[PDB]
């Protein structure tokens, strides 16, 4: 517990309408930007960590549409 | 709102107040010829990406479809408008 | 509940208008049970002129006809147009109410504007019920802001697509499809279209629904305006034009069938251009079509709409949705080659469903079978789908020859 | 931060007077062009050039029975 909240580390188990917010946080959106800019392989150690981070982040759901779309769209404009 | 958009409809009406059902079967990997897509010899403080319509993504719009109709007993009268400001291209 | 009379303190006030200084309380009780007895005998005899002369209002000429009946002298001055005014006087201990009458100069009654002359009694005949229910003749009871430029443009464009003539409609649809600045009028058009498709339930007008579907098809072809924010309104309108059961006023002769395949092509376009993995438009449209098709008790019109939309989505959809329930064709041909009641409408809709099914399943049979197809029809349901598949293979060979 | 840090995020707001003037101007010009082309196509039309309906269509001049009422009277008040 960090001041009451359980962290998601691998040692732990798990009329105008209002202006809406994106369903990702800005830490999560910054994480997505860093992982995608590391996974385009400018540096190899950066890639390898980003690949391990993708391979074992438990909270990588609810970001997965944006990763699948980045993959799919990328291969089609990368061929 | 009787006088708002759809006033023409309101005036015409004359209302004046004021196992094959398993979820996987329907996933589009099992229902789409995605093979055709494979290219055969082709020749963040503010959001990075667009915010989707919460009503389409979340709401049950299916509840505004009609099971039975012309031969049925329900009625309607003036309804409001809202003007979502999330959409760009709207001056106000 | 009890005998209600005028109050005894109302007779002490009256007795001092007379000049009687002290009146004892047994005399005041003797006065008020007599005057409230004579009020109830003119209240109930005025009601006999209100009932026999059929009025249900009790005008003041009813009381004057009853005072004339009880021989008592009439009350003068109660036929003029007045009301009930009272004026409170507080005073230094004497609480009362009075009239506060007003005056008027005599020459302003000699020079008043005269009312209009009355009409004489005449007779009028009209039918109240004609062998049944009442006719709808008028003698019976009945049963943020757009600027003026774009307000006028909205009015002219919407009234051009209601059906006065076809040429103004074609120019209005060619305006909607090919203008650059029609944003700020897209929510009004979406509201107009969705409410107009809803108004089909009060009046089953096929023609106005065809006009609204051509309005949606014209709105989709506009390159400048983006319908992503308003597609949640246009999807159930086209869906209502597809899977509703009464699309016609006369079900047998109206070709609701075309507003079916036109709106099915429209919804295939609306989920080709706009389906994103955040949207889930196409999966949610296929799920509604699928649970409307697989579920029994659904009418042949709504099953026709479901099959039409599912078959306009593409080839893999009819591979994995239509082809498992091909045995349902046998349940259809139960009511076609036999069918106790022949003169019902359940035959034209059934063989329309059959024709659409075998037309769309002929290229699917041409894709996933051998090239010979000798007795595929016999192996197929009813042996007809197989003949259609043979015709489809022949058509494909003809197309290859043309190429 | 991803383990436990959440901040809401909003869409990029365009508060620029230049592009707002441009957007309102171009939308007004486009809706009035669409309105006048629709009204010239679904009515009697004139033309400055011989047989010119696609490019520059003019709504034909109709006479009024009482012209001062449509001239002198204000419409927005």
Task: For B17-61, give the DSSP string.
Answer: ---TTSGGGGSTTSSS-GGGGS-SS----B-SSPPP-HHHHTS-G
B–C interface: beta-carbon pairs under 8 A: 109
Q: At what angle do helices C60-67 and C25-52 cross, to 10 degrees?
A: 110
DSSP type of residue C321: I
Task: Kindly report the nearest CA distance between residue A50 and chain C, in angstroms.
Answer: 24
Instruction: Give C144's contacts in chain D (Cβ within 8 Å).
Output: none
d(CA C105, CA C5): 42
Nearest residue, CB atoms, D12 vs list B46, B86, B91: B46
| C245 vs C251: CA distance, rounded Å | 10
CA of C230 to nearest chain A CA: how many angstroms apart? 14
Q: Cβ–Cβ contacts within 10 Å for residue C274, how many? A: 18
D chain contacts of residue A25, beta-carbon cutoff 8 Å: 5-9
Closest among A18, C398, C286, C343 to B28, alpha carbons compared: C286
Contacts D8 to A, Cβ<8 Å: 21-22, 25-26
Chain D residue numbers touching A28 (CB-CB < 8 A)? 2, 6
Is residue B45 within 8 angstroms of chain D, CB to CB? yes
Chain B: closest CA distance from residue A59 (Å): 18
> What whole-number distance in Å separates Cα of residue A44 and Cα of residue D69?
81
B49 close contact with D: CB closer than 8 A:
no
A65 touches chain C (CB under 8 A): yes
Q: Which residues of D touch C147 (CB under 8 A)?
A: 28
Q: Helices marked H in chain A — which ranges?
A: 26-38, 44-56, 64-77
The method of structure determination was cryo-EM
Q: Compute φ and ψ for C369, nearest 5 degrees.
A: -150, 180
D6/A9 touch (CB, cutoff 8 Å), yes or no? no
Q: Are C227 and C219 in contact (CB under 8 A)?
A: yes
* Other Cβ atoms within 10 Å of C221 Cβ, number: 12
Q: Of C319, C283, C325, C320, give the one whose Cα is nearest residue C303.
A: C325
Can you say whether the dihedral through the CA atoms of C237, C240, C246, C252 is positive or negative?
positive
Contacts of D75 in chain C (CB under 8 A): 148
What's the full length of chain D, in residues? 77
Q: Give the nearest partner residue to A16 out of B37, B47, B83, using CB atoms.
A: B83
Q: Which of D9, D20, D23 is the closest to B45 by Cβ?
A: D9
* Joined tokens for residue C128: 């109240």
Query: Residues of D58-69 as b/e, b for ≥16 C-beta within 10 angstroms?
Result: eeeeeeeeeeee
Give alpha helix (H) positions in C315-347. 315-317, 328-333
Residues of A whose CB is below 8 A from B39: 76, 79
Mutation test of the interface with chain B: which of A15, A21, A22, choosing the one with the most B Cβ atoms within 10 A? A22
Say whether residue D28 is in contact with chain B using an 8 A CB cutoff. Answer: no
Question: To the nearest whole angstrom, how far is the Cα of C108 from the nearest Cα of chain A?
Answer: 56
C180 interaction partners in chain D (CB closer than 8 Å): 26, 30, 33-34
> Out of A21, A27, A57, whose CB is closest to D5?
A27
Contact status of D19 with chain B (Cβ, < 8 Å): no
D10: β partners: B46
- Whichever domain contains C35, its CATH number is 1.10.20.10
CB contact under 8 A, B86 and A20: yes
Q: After which residues is chain D broken (C to N over 2.5 A)?
A: none
Structure tokens at C80: 């003029």
Interface check C225 vs D, CB under 8 A: no
Residues of D whose CB is below 8 A from A21:
8-10
From the number of C-beta atoms within 10 Å of its C-beta (0-12, 13-18, 19+), residue C195 rates as buried
- Beta-bridge partners for C98: C87
With CA atoms as reference, report the closest residue to B31 among C281, C269, C315: C315
**Token reading at D54:** 């696609």
- Residue of C180, C228, C270, C322 to mutate, testing the B interface (most B Cβ within 10 Å of its Cβ): C228
**In angstroms, rounded to a whole number, what is the distance separating the alpha carbons of residues C353 and A28?**
51
Cross-chain residue pair D4–A57, CB shorter than 8 Å? no
Residue of D nearest to B51 (CA): D11
Q: Which of C227, C239, C315, C313 is nearest to C269 (CA)?
A: C313
Q: Which residues of B touch A15 (CB under 8 A)?
A: 80-83
What's the rounded Cα separation, in Å, for the pair C62 and A15?
Answer: 57
Task: Name the neighbours of D, counting chains with at least 3 Cβ pairs within 8 A.
Answer: A, B, C
CA atoms within 13 A on the CB side of D48: 4
Distance from CA of B3 to the nearest CA of D (A): 18
Q: How far apart are CA C339 and CA C345, in angstroms?
A: 11
Cβ-proximal residues to C204 (8 Å cutoff; 6+ apart), any chain: B70, C246, C247, C248, C249
| Domain range enclosing C60 | 8-70
Q: Do B85 and A17 touch (CB under 8 A)?
A: yes
Note whether A59 contacts D2, CB cutoff 8 Å. yes
Contact C156 D29 (CB under 8 A): no
- As a whole number of angstroms, the distance between CA C376 and CA C9 comes to 108
**3-class secondary structure, C209:** helix
Contact A22 B85 (CB under 8 A): no
Resolution value, angstrom units? 6.2
Q: How far is it, in rounded angstroms, from Cα C282 to Cα B28?
A: 8
| Residues in CB range of C68: below 8 A, 6 or more apart | C74
């Amino acid at each position: 517990s960090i001041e009451g909240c359980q962290p998601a580390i691998p040692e732990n188990p798990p009329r105008l309408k209002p202006r809406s917010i994106h369903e990702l946080s800005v830490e999560q959106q910054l994480y997505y930007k860093e992982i995608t800019e590391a996974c385009v392989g400018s540096c190899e150690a950066k890639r390898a960590e980003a690949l391990q981070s993708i391979a074992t982040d438990p909270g990588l759901y609810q970001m997965l549409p944006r990763f699948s779309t980045f993959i799919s769209e990328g291969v089609r404009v990368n061929v | 709102w009787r006088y708002g958009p759809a006033r023409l409809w309101y005036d015409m009406l004359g209302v004046p107040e004021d196992d094959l059902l398993a979820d996987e079967n329907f996933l589009m990997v099992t229902q789409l010829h995605w093979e055709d897509d494979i290219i055969w010899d082709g020749e963040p403080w503010y959001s990075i990406f667009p915010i989707d319509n919460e009503d389409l993504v979340y709401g049950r719009w299916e509840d505004n479809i009609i099971w039975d109709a012309q031969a049925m007993p329900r009625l309607l009268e003036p309804p409001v408008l809202t003007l979502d400001p999330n959409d760009e291209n709207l001056i106000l | 509940l009890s005998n209600t009379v005028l109050p005894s303190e109302s007779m002490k006030v009256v007795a001092e208008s007379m000049g009687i200084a002290q009146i004892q309380e047994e005399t005041c009780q003797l006065l008020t049970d007599e005057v409230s007895y004579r009020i109830k005998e003119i209240a109930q005899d005025a009601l006999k002129f209100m009932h026999m002369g059929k009025r249900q209002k009790l005008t003041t000429s009813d009381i004057d006809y009853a005072l004339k009946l009880k021989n008592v002298e009439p009350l003068y001055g109660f036929h003029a147009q007045e009301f009930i005014p009272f004026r409170f006087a507080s005073g230094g201990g004497r609480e009362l109410y009075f009239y506060e009458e007003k005056e008027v100069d005599l020459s302003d009654i000699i020079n008043t504007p005269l009312p209009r002359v009355p009409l004489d009694v005449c007779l009028k005949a009209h039918w109240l019920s004609i062998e049944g229910c009442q006719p709808a003749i008028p003698e019976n009871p009945p049963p943020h802001e757009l600027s003026v430029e774009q307000q006028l443009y909205y009015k002219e464009i919407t009234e051009a697509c209601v059906g006065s003539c076809e040429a103004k409609r074609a120019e209005a649809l060619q305006s909607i499809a090919t203008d650059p600045g029609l944003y700020q009028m897209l929510p009004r058009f979406s509201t107009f279209i969705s409410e107009g498709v809803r108004v089909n339930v009060v009046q089953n007008n096929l023609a106005l629904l065809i006009y609204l579907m051509r309005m949606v098809k014209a709105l989709m072809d506009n390159p400048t305006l983006y319908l992503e924010k308003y597609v949640h309104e246009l999807i159930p309108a086209v869906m209502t034009c597809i899977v509703s059961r009464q699309l016609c006023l006369r079900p047998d002769v109206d070709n609701h069938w075309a507003l079916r395949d036109f709106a099915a092509r429209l919804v295939a376009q609306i989920c080709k251009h706009f389906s994103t993995t955040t949207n889930n438009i196409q999966s949610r449209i296929t799920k509604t079509f699928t649970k409307s098709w697989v579920d029994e008790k659904t009418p042949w019109t709504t099953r026709y709409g479901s099959i039409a939309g599912l078959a306009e989505l593409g080839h893999d959809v009819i591979k994995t949705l239509i082809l498992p329930r091909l045995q349902q064709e046998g349940e259809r041909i139960r009511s076609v080659l036999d069918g106790p009641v022949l003169s019902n409408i359940d035959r034209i809709g059934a063989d329309h469903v059959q024709s659409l099914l075998l037309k769309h399943c002929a290229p699917v049979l041409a894709k996933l079978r051998p090239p010979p197809d000798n007795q595929d029809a016999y192996r197929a349901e009813f042996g007809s789908l197989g003949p259609l598949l043979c015709s489809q293979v022949v058509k494909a060979r003809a197309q290859a020859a043309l190429q | 931060p991803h383990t436990y840090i959440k901040t809401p995020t909003y869409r990029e707001p365009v508060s620029d007077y230049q592009v707002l003037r441009e957007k309102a101007a171009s939308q007004r010009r486009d809706v009035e062009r669409a309105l006048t082309r629709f009204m010239a196509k679904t009515g009697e039309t004139q033309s400055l050039f011989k047989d010119d309906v696609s490019t520059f269509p003019l709504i034909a001049a109709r006479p009024f029975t009482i012209p001062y009422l449509t001239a002198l009277l204000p419409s927005e008040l």
